[PDB]
Ligand binder design. Structure first.
Ligand SMILES: [Ca+2]
Length: 237
C-alpha cells in the first residue's frame, strides 16, 4: 500500500486539527476504507518547507498518495473511492443518487443564519434552516428501494434505517455529518438553537452517527468549532 497522508488546516494552537467539514469528511472516508494512513496538520500562518514543496498552490486539504499530490476535497474523495476499492477495501458510494444530495443545503442555510447581523432577518433565516432540516428528516423517514413493501416497521410507511442510504455509512454521510456537527455546535452556542426533537429521523440519524467512532472521533472539539465561528456569529445584536 502506497503511503497515504492527509494534510489538513491546523486549529487555534497551530497543532491540533482545525475546524473544517472538508478535513473531517476526508478523515472519515479514510477511516471507513480501513487503509493505513496518517494526518498532518498545517499551520497556514507558518507553513513548513516540506508542505510548500508538496503543494506550492497552498490548497487545503490535500492528499499525498505515494508521491502524488491531490487537491480539491471532492476530487480527493473521488480518487480515494476509486483507488481504495474492492476486494481489498469496501466501496463506500451510496446506491441511491438522492442520498448524495439530501440535506446538503442545510449548511448554506446555516451559514446565512449564523453570518447574518440584521435583526430583522433572524426569524426568517432560522425558518429557512428549520425547513432544510425538515426536508432531511423527510428523506430519512422515507423508505428506500431496499425497503420496498416491507411490513416489519413500527410505524407504517416510516423508514427506520440507520443512515442516509441504508444501514451502512457511505460517502454521502461523510459529506453531510461533519456539516451537521458544525451546525449543532455553533447554533447551540450562539443562537440558542437546537434541532427540534420532533425531527425524529434526523435525531435517530445523529444518534446512530455519534455512536460510530469514525464520526465521533473525527470531530474537532467543541471549543475549536465555537472559536472558528465566534466573530461572524457574535455580529448579530
Ligand atoms: Ca430557539
Amino acid at each position: 500500500q502506497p503511503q497515504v497522508e492527509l494534510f489538513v488546516k491546523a486549529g487555534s494552537d497551530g497543532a491540533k486539527i482545525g475546524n473544517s467539514p472538508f478535513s473531517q469528511r476526508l478523515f472519515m472516508v479514510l477511516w471507513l476504507k480501513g487503509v493505513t494512513f496518517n494526518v498532518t496538520t498545517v499551520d497556514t500562518k507558518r507553513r513548513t518547507e516540506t508542505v510548500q514543496k508538496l503543494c506550492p498552490g497552498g490548497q487545503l486539504p490535500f492528499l499525498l498518495y505515494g508521491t502524488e499530490v491531490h487537491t480539491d476535497t471532492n476530487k480527493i474523495e473521488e480518487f480515494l473511492e476509486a483507488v481504495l476499492c474492492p476486494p481489498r477495501y469496501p466501496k463506500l458510494a451510496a446506491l441511491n443518487p438522492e442520498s448524495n444530495t439530501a440535506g446538503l443545503d442545510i449548511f448554506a442555510k446555516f451559514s446565512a443564519y449564523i453570518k447574518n447581523s440584521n435583526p430583522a432577518l433572524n426569524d426568517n433565516l432560522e425558518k429557512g434552516l428549520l425547513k432544510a432540516l425538515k426536508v432531511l428528516d423527510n428523506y430519512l423517514t422515507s423508505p428506500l428501494p431496499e425497503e420496498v413493501d416491507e411490513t416489519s416497521a413500527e410505524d407504517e410507511g416510516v423508514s427506520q434505517r440507520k443512515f442516509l442510504d441504508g444501514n451502512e455509512l457511505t460517502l454521502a454521510d461523510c459529506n453531510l455529518l461533519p456539516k451537521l456537527h458544525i451546525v449543532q455546535v455553533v447554533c447551540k452556542k450562539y443562537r440558542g438553537f437546537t434541532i427540534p426533537e420532533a425531527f425524529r429521523g434526523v435525531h435517530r440519524y445523529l444518534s446512530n452517527a455519534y455512536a460510530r467512532e469514525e464520526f465521533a472521533s473525527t470531530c474537532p472539539d467543541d471549543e475549536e468549532i465555537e472559536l472558528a465561528y465566534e466573530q461572524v456569529a457574535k455580529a448579530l445584536k
